[PDB]
Amino acid sequence: SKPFTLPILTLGELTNSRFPLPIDVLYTNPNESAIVQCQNGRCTLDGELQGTTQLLPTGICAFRGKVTQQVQDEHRGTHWNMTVTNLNGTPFDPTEDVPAPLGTPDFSGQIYGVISQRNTNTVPGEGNLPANRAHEAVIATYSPKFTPKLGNIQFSTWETQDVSSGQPTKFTPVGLASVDANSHFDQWTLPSYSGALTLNMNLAPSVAPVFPGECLLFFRSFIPLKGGYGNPAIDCLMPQEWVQHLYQESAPSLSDVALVRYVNPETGRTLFEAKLHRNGFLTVARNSAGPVVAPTNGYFRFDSWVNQFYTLAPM
Amino acid sequence: SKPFTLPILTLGELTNSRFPLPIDVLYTNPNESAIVQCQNGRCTLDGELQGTTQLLPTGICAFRGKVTQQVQDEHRGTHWNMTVTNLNGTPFDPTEDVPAPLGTPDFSGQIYGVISQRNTNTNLPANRAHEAVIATYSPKFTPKLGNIQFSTWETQDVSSGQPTKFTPVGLASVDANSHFDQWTLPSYSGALTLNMNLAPSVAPVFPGECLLFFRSFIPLKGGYGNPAIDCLMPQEWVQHLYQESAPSLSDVALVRYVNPETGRTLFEAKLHRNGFLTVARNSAGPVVAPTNGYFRFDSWVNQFYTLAPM
């Protein structure tokens, strides 16, 4: 059996698997009441991608498709419907056993970014080159019109008219539009992928500590805002480089729990230890919420396969 | 001696190391007259990062810093002077042996993106973001001196003295006046000053060979065009080589592009020690290849090895 390994990357060399952001800090929140069941950044230790997880950092919270038409919506702004394909441009087949096209956002909120278009049709006078446009845009993932599993979503723009029907369209995510109460930001609330009143399917399972005294450990990034007050964050279970590494290696999991040590390169010492679980998440023995205050040159080193009855040294 | 390897990734699982884009096609252009000396996506086969190359996909063509002054354009828009730090927030030290802060763009053009800010002071801090353009050919583009300028359509709502992020999205224009040239380096310290600490230029040295690129198409804010950015190796290869740091056993690795389903080799290429590919091809344009194909290391060869024609 191929030996299990993690990449050798300090925190400052890792990126979030749930939004295109660098990892800023490690983080715990033991008293979290929500069920933790994110769909991006989901990969087993033996390399099986789950939920809506795909490998490209550029694909996380991205969409590709075509605008159909401007549409009416009660909310302010100018609204547009777009069909969505797979990120590789092939038609999304709703009979595949995934919750939504891979890369689809996995949380409730107003995702701010840029919609860009490059026309299919070309002009001989322009050297046979297509016309283009891009504009800031917001995708409300809690909207009844957010139906990526049905192959269509809606976005809104400040721009009132310069979005073209029937043309190839890309959404590049940048941040959140707002985190006011009215903007329904909740990182642990899944979108309804097929719309209002429908049940999501094919989900990666929820994650939780099972051993007393343990809590989830997250890789946290702070997410930009278009406006308003706030310091919002997105917490992932494993960074995108771990997803990429595990997928590559596909090493057999020799037990249900790997023991890992967070180590300082300069000192050589272990700052704390953690359980890395088979389904792809970490727990630590810690009784507080907030950041883990440690150097960003620190990294996780795989020590050995253990089991659920292993007692972690307290942080 | 740790064996040399490449990741197992299809084109559809790779991203560009010079701009945050997926790889769209493999590409050649034998008649290219420009010197190819890009500074992002530069890594030797034994894992030495060069130029302005760093590991984060989010760091490519990114900046961090603080705005210091608003300067109105003569006719339209507003410019903003920005002091830049390293992407990790530490102060940029110009005496370090790099051309510019890691992640700095490595080409001439109008780079379009979003400037966002989260204030230091507060119980929750204020935020704003706006579309922005950074003209990397501008005399005000001096990242090696710790400062740049960006322009916005927004005329007032950018704050001074507050943490600022640039997230790149595409190009503003590729019209004549927008000076897009993917192989022209910016003057990192301004026009009268020589760039320093550069990753070396790359070229075939054998007749009949040409560079092989990983090409991505880059979005446009407006106008006509179908611009592309070509990298020498994808970001995932940079990350892999850095991790492995396998000893290079000659100056040229032979790699095969293979179809996993049929197990057949579609073509072979030279992967040079300095971190770039050549092939024996006498035409320009995309390489047409099955979607399941990827490069596999075969063996070390030398500069005199003759590639099978494509």
Ligand SMILES: CC(=O)N[C@@H]1[C@@H](O)[C@H](O[C@@H]2O[C@H](CO)[C@H](O)[C@H](O)[C@H]2O[C@H]2O[C@@H](C)[C@@H](O)[C@@H](O)[C@@H]2O)[C@@H](CO)O[C@H]1O
């Ligand atoms: C008030 C305002 O800012 N309106 C902008 C409008 O100016 C933008 O249109 C672009 O403007 C640049 C200015 O140098 C050029 O004129 C571009 O050609 C133009 O983009 C237009 O390009 C043609 C070929 C079509 O593709 C149009 O759909 C496209 O708008 C636009 C787009 O950036 O944004 C408005 O809000």
